[PDB]
Amino acid sequence: PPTNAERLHEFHRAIGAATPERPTPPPPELLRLRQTLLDEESAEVRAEIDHLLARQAAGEALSAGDLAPLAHALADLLYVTYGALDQLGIDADAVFAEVHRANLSPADVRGVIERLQH
C-alpha cells in the first residue's frame, strides 16, 4: 500500500507540480505557496474545533458522524504538510521516522536530509 507521503508524490506529478527526488533548495514562490496552504488548512481545523466546542458548550451530545468535518480538515492539513515536504524533495516518511524514534524513546533531521541527498 502507498504511504500518504508517496500519495503526495502521485498528486504533484498529476497536477504538474514540482516534486524533486532529493532535497532541493526551493524558490521563494514555492515557500510562499506552502505557507499559504498551511495557513488555509490550519484555519479550517481551528474553525471546526471551534464549532465542536460551541455545540458541546450548549449541551449537544456529539456523535461520531459529527467529527467528520474536523477529520476532513485534519486530513487536509496532513495533505499540505506532506505536500510541503514533497515539494522540497524531502522524503517525509524518512523524516517522520527519525522524529518518531526520538519521541518514542534527539531527532537528527539534518542527518536525514544529508542521507537523502545520496
Ligand X SMILES: O=c1ccn([C@H]2C[C@H](O)[C@@H](COP(=O)(O)O)O2)c(=O)[nH]1
Q: Interaction with ligand X in 9-68: which residues (CB under 6 A)?
A: 37, 40
At 117, which amino acid appears?
Q
Q: What is the per-residue binding string for ligand X in 68-87, x denoting contact by CB under 6 A?
A: --------x--xx--x----
CA distance 93 to 71: 21
Burial group, residue 94, by CB count within 10 angstroms (0-12, 13-18, 19+): middle
> Footprint of ligand X on residues 89-118 (CB under 6 A)?
99, 103
Task: Select the binding partner of residue 6 from a second copy, ligand X, none (C-beta < 5 to 8 A, by kind).
Answer: none
The closest alpha carbon to 89, from 5, 14, 4, 16, belongs to 5
Task: Select the binding partner of residue 84 from a second copy, ligand X, none (C-beta < 5 to 8 A, by kind).
Answer: a second copy
CA distance 42 to 104: 26
Q: Is 78 in the site for a second copy (CB under 8 A)?
A: yes
Q: Is 90 in the site for a second copy (CB under 8 A)?
A: yes
